[PDB]
Scaffold this motif. Structure first.
Motif, short mmCIF file in Angstrom:
data_model
loop_
_atom_site.label_atom_id
_atom_site.label_comp_id
_atom_site.label_asym_id
_atom_site.label_seq_id
_atom_site.Cartn_x
_atom_site.Cartn_y
_atom_site.Cartn_z
N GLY A 9 -19.56 -66.10 74.69
CA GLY A 9 -19.64 -66.23 74.04
C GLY A 9 -19.27 -65.30 72.88
N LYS A 10 -19.09 -64.45 73.05
CA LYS A 10 -17.78 -64.15 71.67
C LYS A 10 -16.49 -64.64 71.38
CE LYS A 10 -18.65 -59.79 73.40
NZ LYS A 10 -19.90 -59.60 73.64
N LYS A 11 -16.06 -65.54 72.53
CA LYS A 11 -15.04 -65.70 72.48
C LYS A 11 -15.22 -67.80 71.80
CE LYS A 11 -14.01 -64.05 76.69
NZ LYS A 11 -14.40 -64.91 78.35
N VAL A 12 -16.29 -68.41 71.75
CA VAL A 12 -16.73 -69.47 71.02
C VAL A 12 -17.34 -69.23 70.09
CG1 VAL A 12 -18.45 -70.89 71.65
CG2 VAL A 12 -17.24 -70.48 73.73
N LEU A 13 -17.69 -67.89 69.29
CA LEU A 13 -17.74 -67.70 68.09
C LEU A 13 -16.59 -67.25 67.32
CD1 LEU A 13 -20.89 -67.23 67.22
CD2 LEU A 13 -20.81 -65.30 66.18
N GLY A 14 -15.76 -66.23 67.64
CA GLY A 14 -14.53 -66.24 67.37
C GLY A 14 -13.97 -68.37 67.11
N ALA A 15 -13.86 -68.76 67.77
CA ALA A 15 -13.48 -70.01 67.77
C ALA A 15 -13.90 -70.73 66.48
CB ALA A 15 -12.89 -71.13 69.21
N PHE A 16 -15.28 -70.46 66.21
CA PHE A 16 -16.01 -70.94 65.65
C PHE A 16 -15.53 -70.19 63.96
CE2 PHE A 16 -19.32 -73.26 67.85
CZ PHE A 16 -19.25 -73.76 67.23
N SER A 17 -15.23 -69.00 64.13
CA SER A 17 -15.03 -68.40 62.71
C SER A 17 -13.79 -68.77 62.17
CB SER A 17 -14.98 -66.98 63.25
OG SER A 17 -16.21 -66.73 63.20
N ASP A 18 -12.51 -69.10 63.83
CA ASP A 18 -11.24 -69.53 62.89
C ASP A 18 -11.55 -71.14 62.32
OD1 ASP A 18 -10.42 -67.51 64.22
OD2 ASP A 18 -9.86 -68.08 66.09
N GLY A 19 -12.13 -71.95 62.80
CA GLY A 19 -12.64 -73.24 62.74
C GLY A 19 -13.06 -72.56 60.82
N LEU A 20 -14.12 -72.30 60.90
CA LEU A 20 -14.37 -71.92 59.84
C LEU A 20 -13.68 -71.29 58.72
CD1 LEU A 20 -18.43 -70.54 59.60
CD2 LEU A 20 -17.72 -72.09 57.92
N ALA A 21 -12.89 -70.69 58.97
CA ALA A 21 -11.49 -70.63 57.89
C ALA A 21 -10.99 -71.65 57.51
CB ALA A 21 -10.63 -69.38 59.08
N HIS A 22 -10.69 -72.76 58.50
CA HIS A 22 -9.90 -73.61 58.30
C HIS A 22 -10.63 -74.84 58.65
CE1 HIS A 22 -7.01 -70.44 59.69
NE2 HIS A 22 -6.33 -71.04 59.81
N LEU A 23 -11.32 -75.31 57.08
CA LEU A 23 -11.83 -76.19 56.89
C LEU A 23 -11.84 -77.57 57.21
CD1 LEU A 23 -15.53 -74.79 55.42
CD2 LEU A 23 -15.33 -75.86 57.98
N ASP A 24 -10.64 -76.85 56.34
CA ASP A 24 -9.54 -78.35 55.95
C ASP A 24 -8.80 -78.65 57.15
OD1 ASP A 24 -8.57 -76.36 55.51
OD2 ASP A 24 -7.84 -76.56 53.54
N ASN A 25 -8.52 -77.86 58.23
CA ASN A 25 -7.75 -78.31 59.19
C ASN A 25 -8.00 -78.63 60.23
OD1 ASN A 25 -5.49 -79.50 60.57
ND2 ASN A 25 -4.09 -77.33 59.81
N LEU A 26 -9.97 -78.80 60.59
CA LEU A 26 -10.63 -78.61 61.46
C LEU A 26 -9.63 -78.69 63.02
CD1 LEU A 26 -14.57 -78.50 61.21
CD2 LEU A 26 -12.57 -77.10 62.27
N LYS A 27 -9.52 -80.91 63.19
CA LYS A 27 -8.17 -81.45 63.72
C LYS A 27 -7.23 -80.08 64.26
CE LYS A 27 -8.56 -85.16 63.47
NZ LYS A 27 -10.20 -85.56 64.54
N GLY A 28 -6.48 -80.24 63.37
CA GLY A 28 -5.92 -79.29 64.30
C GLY A 28 -5.59 -78.02 64.12
N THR A 29 -6.64 -77.22 64.09
CA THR A 29 -6.75 -75.66 64.30
C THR A 29 -7.23 -75.42 65.97
OG1 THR A 29 -7.83 -74.43 62.47
CG2 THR A 29 -8.54 -73.80 64.32
#
Ligand code: HEM
Ligand code: HEM
Ligand code: HEM
Ligand code: HEM
Lengths: 143, 140, 140, 143
Positions: D64-84
């Motif tokens: 769950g820590k890793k899945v949330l880190g990916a959710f945070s990484d996606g949140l930081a790159h909301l305009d590039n979710l497909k590439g993230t």
């Protein structure tokens, strides 16, 4: 949609033997009958109470003809489905408010109608090719 | 929730299916394996080639299960309870796979019984298969 | 098919919901309207602004219907039959909207009863709301 | 994901108050409990029978820590979710064979966990913004 050359050849040969004016209308009518909440979009057509009233509606038949015309355009350009269905996707998403699951439902109903009409000719490999074709069309519409 | 109309419709449709149930189920499983290869992950011990005896036997098993579900349509949760425990507690099958198998069963029925596959019978069979899929997926 | 254990869980959870049911239902409807604007198309005659009396009354109605469904969990198709006819025959609501409303109800319950919202209670409420959505969507 | 500036500001402020190590594992455990068929993918995590055994699993907490880190990484790159989320999409599709619907389920469970934690601070507009965020993340993973 990526297909093998054999799958593309099989899909096109079955498509040539397709009676558009009939099978499009009966696919739309079967969608309206099996999934009755889809009649909300087609209330303007008229009498859609009984299955026989749905399947005997000239408006349903004409709209099925249009839907199959759109499907045939996708078969012609399987490598550019997203660009082919841009206007229809805009119309279905912004003007009609159709849920994207209904596209998959209509594709499955079309596959069932093709199986109904071709019988033995609609072999499991042909069904798999058509399944991924209609999945690609639904994904293009859902964009 | 099924109505008496679609209950009689599915009963008549499966009755006219009759003794071809095993081959129909085997063909439905073959169609599911061919068109949805992710469903093959639930059968890692099987031989999933064309004409496989394992697939034929499993199709016969699925067909007999459908027959007894039809015979006990009003008491499905109890009649199908051993299958519900197998599929939900042990196998942990995604309900999307049940939807795919129901679609392939409908395609097989359409291809083999054109006259019987009226729109009303199609809707009845769709609802019956959805009810069967809910009982097997549910854990209770 | 609801488990006996999940039935007790939903009964206790909605009993502790108690007299805040109308406000909770109004807030759930507001959340559904805000986060899924396509659901607003089913209420073209409503005022769907914040603090709307129409939305508050409809939330009260939905909450009372849910209370009746909880009180009649074992015979839901009989207790909810007038609502089933309304939503399926007349309104013809897509079941995806029922899923969205169930999720918004779960979010409201999580935000208002943190202690009561254990994982087991969450699963029980999810299954209960799915069962309720099945009966209203089905035509029988 | 397109968000208004106010929605982005509200989403980020709530995200700062998020306890990653707890809420990621909470969301994963609630997913495994509410949708028990998802335990097929995590049968290697050990005891996952009872809800209390699921919520008390260190492997579940770490994942769950890793899945949330990916959710945070996606949140930081909301305009590039497909590439993230390209590598994760490849892993979840080709290697794990996880359904696209399951990703939507996990997003909804995460929204429920956020509501359960924030309570009154979570507000219907904040929830709507987070719904759009998690829908975009699920669509990026499903590509
Ligand atoms: C899945 C593949 C689909 C295709 C290829 C397709 C194709 C089309 C086409 C070509 C039109 C234009 C009709 C015209 O210009 O007169 C149209 C309109 C429309 N579509 Fe679809 N459609 C699909 C799915 C759906 C579904 C599933 C629904 C409803 C559940 C739906 C609802 C409508 C409605 C209400 C209209 C307007 C009808 C009218 O203006 O009279 N579509 N569609
Ligand atoms: C939809 C209606 C279905 C019915 C009526 C059905 C019925 C059955 C039956 C009768 C068995 C044999 C149980 C036994 O011999 O003890 C079985 C086993 C099994 N089922 Fe299903 N099933 C259905 C759906 C599915 C689906 C969709 C999947 C996976 C995608 C699935 C996966 C399995 C597996 C893996 C087994 C174990 C077979 C073996 O290990 O030999 N089932 N099912
Ligand atoms: C668990 C889910 C639901 C419950 C318990 C429920 C309950 C109710 C109740 C009690 C009424 C009032 C009926 C009357 O006063 O005669 C109603 C009406 C209505 N419902 Fe629902 N409902 C649910 C889901 C939905 C959803 C998801 C939608 C649309 C997205 C919807 C659309 C409507 C509409 C449009 C009305 C008419 C209200 C009016 O015209 O004033 N319902 N529902
Ligand atoms: C928005 C949804 C999801 C996100 C953001 C997400 C994110 C991640 C991340 C960051 C990893 C770690 C990859 C690595 O360490 O290399 C992972 C792996 C994994 N995911 Fe997900 N995931 C999502 C949904 C799901 C769902 C719903 C399931 C199952 C139902 C699932 C099953 C798995 C499994 C089995 C692994 C590998 C676990 C392991 O190797 O120990 N994922 N995912």
């Amino acid at each position: 949609v990526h297909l093998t050359p054999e799958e593309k050849s099989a899909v096109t040969a079955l498509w040539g033997k397709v009676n558009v004016d009939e099978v499009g209308g009966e696919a739309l009518g079967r969608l309206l009958v099996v999934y009755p909440w889809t009649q909300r979009f087609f209330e303007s057509f008229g009498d859609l109470s009984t299955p026989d009233a749905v399947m005997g509606n000239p408006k349903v038949k004409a709209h099925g003809k249009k839907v199959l015309g759109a499907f045939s355009d996708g078969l012609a350009h399987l490598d550019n489905l997203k660009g082919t269905f841009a206007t229809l996707s805009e119309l279905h998403c912004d003007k009609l408010h159709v849920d994207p699951e209904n596209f998959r439902l209509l594709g499955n109903v079309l596959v069932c109608v093709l199986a109904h009409h071709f019988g033995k000719e609609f072999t499991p490999p042909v069904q798999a090719a058509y399944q991924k074709v209609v999945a690609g069309v639904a994904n293009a519409l859902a964009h | 929730v099924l109505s008496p109309a679609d209950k009689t419709n599915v009963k008549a449709a499966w009755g006219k299916v009759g003794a071809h149930a095993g081959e129909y189920g085997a063909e439905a499983l073959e169609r599911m394996f061919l068109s949805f290869p992710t469903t093959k992950t639930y059968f890692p011990h099987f031989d999933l080639s064309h004409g496989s005896a394992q697939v034929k036997g499993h199709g016969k098993k699925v067909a007999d299960a459908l027959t007894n579900a039809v015979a006990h349509v009003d008491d499905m949760p109890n009649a199908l309870s051993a299958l519900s425990d197998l599929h939900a507690h042990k196998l942990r099958v995604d309900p999307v796979n049940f939807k795919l198998l129901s679609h392939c069963l409908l395609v097989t029925l359409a291809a083999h019984l054109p006259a019987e596959f009226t729109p009303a019978v199609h809707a009845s069979l769709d609802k019956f298969l959805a009810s069967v899929s809910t009982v097997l997926t549910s854990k209770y």
